[model samples]
Target: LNGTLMQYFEWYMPNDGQHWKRLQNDSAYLAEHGITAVWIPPAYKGTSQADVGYGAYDLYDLGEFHQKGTVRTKYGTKGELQSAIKSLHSRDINVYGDVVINHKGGADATEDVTAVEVDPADRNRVISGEHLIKAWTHFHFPGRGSTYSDFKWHWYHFDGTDWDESRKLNRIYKFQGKAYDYLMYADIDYDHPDVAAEIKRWGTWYANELQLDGFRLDAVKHIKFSFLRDWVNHVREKTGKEMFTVAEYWQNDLGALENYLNKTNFNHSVFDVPLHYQFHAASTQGGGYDMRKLLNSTVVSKHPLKAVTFVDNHDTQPGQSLESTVQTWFKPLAYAFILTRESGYPQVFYGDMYGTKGDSQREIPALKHKIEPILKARKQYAYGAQHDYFDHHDIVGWTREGDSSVANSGLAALITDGPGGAKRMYVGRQNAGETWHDITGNRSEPVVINSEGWGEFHVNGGSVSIYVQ
Candidate 1:
């Protein structure tokens, strides 16, 4: 899925606060650059303060369609949102909006407990008491029990506290400068009848009324997998099977990730966080990572083909520089490896949707220019056979066999990135004569084969060279 750079424009709202005009401009620009599906940020209203979209107030407010936040929030109004989706559809671009349904803002003492008690799972369902939790203490409740009491919480929470120590937790605490949602932004009792109905109604409306094709669920790691299963089932029932929903689960352990996936019943996709982290570590340092070995290791699963593979995303920001990866030639090799070797629905991020302004917007243009060609290549040759030949921490290589229909024009190649950012690239076709043309530089090279009959060519540092047979 494509993402807009407008995520960098913290305060800019589009279509007079009713819609995202600037974001639309970016979407159109990406289409021109070969991106067809865009996964935008949480298009909901930002917090009352400066907390971005994570701290929610009202999910219904789309901001005023007026302009800026003068009358609405930072993203846009409901009408503007619908218009943006319609426009994007006209261009054949799909929109996967970000949705944070796992938790709400600060918990409501009376309403929270009332909602909980009424919730089928919470037997008491009424507020029996209250307490204030500090920033650094373990999350616990007074005489009642530990707040981390549920199996979901125990399996998910990774705050470095022991499972036993978390039992004495008292009241919800503060985290990252905001009132804790118990463990999340706010603890949500999904089984609560009122809360479940409210979520079903809202999720259904967002998918059906707004004509949104899918959702990017935020913080899936912190919520109950059962909650997601039911919620996703509700959405599917509303929008039919054609629509899609994907969750953002950013943990690196393969087993931990599979646990969440195994529990989700509705047909939903998940962001491949393990693969992204692996790519970053492998590309940054030439060490113990074996790309070929990792790629070849397969665990049988029901949704293996549906996994969304990506090299980076917004959360990986300020660390690996997703923008820079696209601008440099090395990015093409990475894309080539993923597109040709991995088995999943691949996603290519082309920096932010909006134009860059400062440090946040640094690599906008270069990202667009670098990824467009690779996207085209993936779409054109996606059905071919892909193989992983060699891989090390610093260097990984693969080749794609052209389809039988395009055998004359098919190509194959090996790519490498060394410890010091050095690169070696090569590609050739089976039936092509001894000479071939290099598209990038409009140059030509001879296909030389040794005793093994393997035609090869050496590439310069940080360069991509292609050979067509």
Candidate 2:
């Protein structure tokens, strides 16, 4: 019942093309550490050898064909990717492919199309009259010629692009009788039957070929919500697998996220962005932040089963577009909260676990040493009925009453953003006199549960402690 997932790559990983190999070797370690699923980066061929999957050039060329000036993607060759996936599967670890289907990039050629310039602020408002413009919409896969499918992308397959090569001007252009959705400035027209059918074909092929356990969908907000629901249902029906899909619906407002969830018919889980924002607030504000409000207005609080709880991701990581990083010190507390709590499918980011390794030219430290203990606690003691004690604004704690079926599987987690704090919580009457020690090693003393199932838990300032027997 306790399954954990880890994103195995960072945004700034090296272009050395050894990530697949590294993941291949890390399967045993990951399984040992209770990481049941690994959400890998996109393995498709992009514009260049250094392209990090988002700049999807060819869905058919997964480091197989000689496209994008390299036989291998930024991660590695197709064979290496397969081998890595095999290694994870052999270790009983699930592999979920990162799906980026909103648009295409690095077209092989340009096509002349009649389009009108649209205002950036109000996309529906056309600024310029209809005129012929050269747009990068011709995606004739020359390197991999009709090996998979004979389908080739043309201007009709797309809505429009921002760059008009006819006048060499950069402006949002909406093709005649079409609308918008710009990613990589190639804006795919999913409304077109051919375009929709081709995407479905590729999705089916991708899943069948890799034997993917699921997908981590990229940017579902920009794409048509109805289209996504149907696409997901299509993939599931074609593969006959549950295809555990989680969408990156990047929205901080829980209401917007909930609306999207409802609109999409809840076919997929979305990342707990509001919870991440709360972590950001707690980190930035420190003691000034209300510990009680940490779980307020969060997806986990409302829809725990459909929440993919995370601290930070590629976009939220430093130097990215959505750079709201949780402080290093507060991270342990956040991790403790997610890992120990009985809500949401928690994800351990590669950047957070092993640190980032872009072109930093310096070693970025990993929270592996600090977070490992909490990971262990999650596997070992986070079970049975949970009781939260958010009594104080600065100090918060919770207890998980051990299940009768699981041995030594109860825990009390305490957190304090301000000075040293304590909370009187229940550890269950069954373990009334059982002594508990801090698994986090932050506290030296042990606490014994009273006859009334009440136990006073203490935590250091700006720290977290997970107590278990």
Candidate 3:
């Protein structure tokens, strides 16, 4: 439960087939820095070399076939990815593959199909009458014909397509007489038994072939809820692997997230999207935001074990669609809040560790120097019974009493959204009269505790400080 995970890619990573090799080289370094697991990008071949794994072309072709105009995917060849996973495993780092099953692109041929236009905003509303349209619905894996599986995709296997060659228009079109809604290009139909069963087979192959420790499901909200539940359960049962699964249900409403979890019978963990928004709002709101409302209505507040907390990811970077970048000044404070608490599993973003290069001249500064200390603190001193101090509007703090099982495992953390302040916290009688210093380096002075185990911990304005012995 104290383990930390890292998302190892950004939206702008180079497509030179070097990322997997880089991960292999960085395995020991990441392990030393307290990264116990990594959520890698989609390993299968996409629509092209430039596709960032979302435009999934072939699930079976993980850089193993000459499909999509390339023998290797954007990351690397299959051999290199396998080697990288082995290297990470040697260092006790688990690998979680990204699963994309909602839609697909880059079909081999087009076919004539009957379809009708639908409102993009309201997918259930039909916008036009039914007509014959040419859609890219024929997926013949001629590159590697029937090598792994004999499954082939056709118009009947999908629910919708985004384009029509006859109409020459870019509109959402649902297949004739089929229950469909707009999600992406050639949205898959889980209602089709063949489609559902084929996807499950692919899931089993992915787990066994890659020997994956877990999965990070992509675009889960777009797929049918029951399909995901069945797919996950089937894969887990077949592999007999205690897989750590999490999904990207990208809704900002906490109630919506809770409902999804309930509907799915709490089958998987979800990213704490509402918490990310709270961090962004607090970071940009100056001193007007209340510190006590930080964790309000968050998944961590309701279901701690099922919350995978993160401040920023590839989508939340500077130029992505869900862009709400947290200011650089408030990053450390946000990291401390997640890494030190005993609530949810925290994830570090690669873009935050290494500075981000956006689509243009916008550059997000690297916070590795500031974040390393907090990671070290989490590894060493964040343990045992916890105490909270969310009693102030602008300042808040917490403490972890030393555990008898761990040596010198006690810490006190303080953060402020406004001016610098001090909080008198109890560090336990075992730490009385002991000296503690700020590990964040924001303050160099050491504070001593009295006979009653109380110390006044201080933090810089708009920053965080972790006092450890």
What candidate 3 gets wrong by more than 4 Å, as runs, is 177-184
**Lowest-lDDT window of 10 residues in candidate 3?**
176-185
Clashes of 1: 29
lDDT string for model 1 (239-321, tens) is 77555677777676667667787888536878766666545655555444454544632221235654777655555543232
RMSD, one per candidate, in order: 9.7, 2.0, 2.0
State the weakest 10-residue window (summed lDDT) of model 2: 176-185
TM-score list, all predictions: 0.69, 0.97, 0.97
Output the lDDT of residue 151, model 2. Answer: 94
- Candidate lDDT scores, in order, read 0.49, 0.88, 0.89
Stretches of candidate 2 exceeding 4 Å from the true structure: 177-184, 358-364
Q: In candidate 3, which residue pairs clash? A: none
- Candidate 3 residues 184-236, lDDT tens each? 36889999999999999999999888889999999888888888988889999
- Runs in model 1 deviating more than 4 A are 1-19, 26-29, 49-51, 64-70, 106-184, 286-303, 319-330, 340-342, 350-365, 391-395, 404-409, 419-454, 462-469
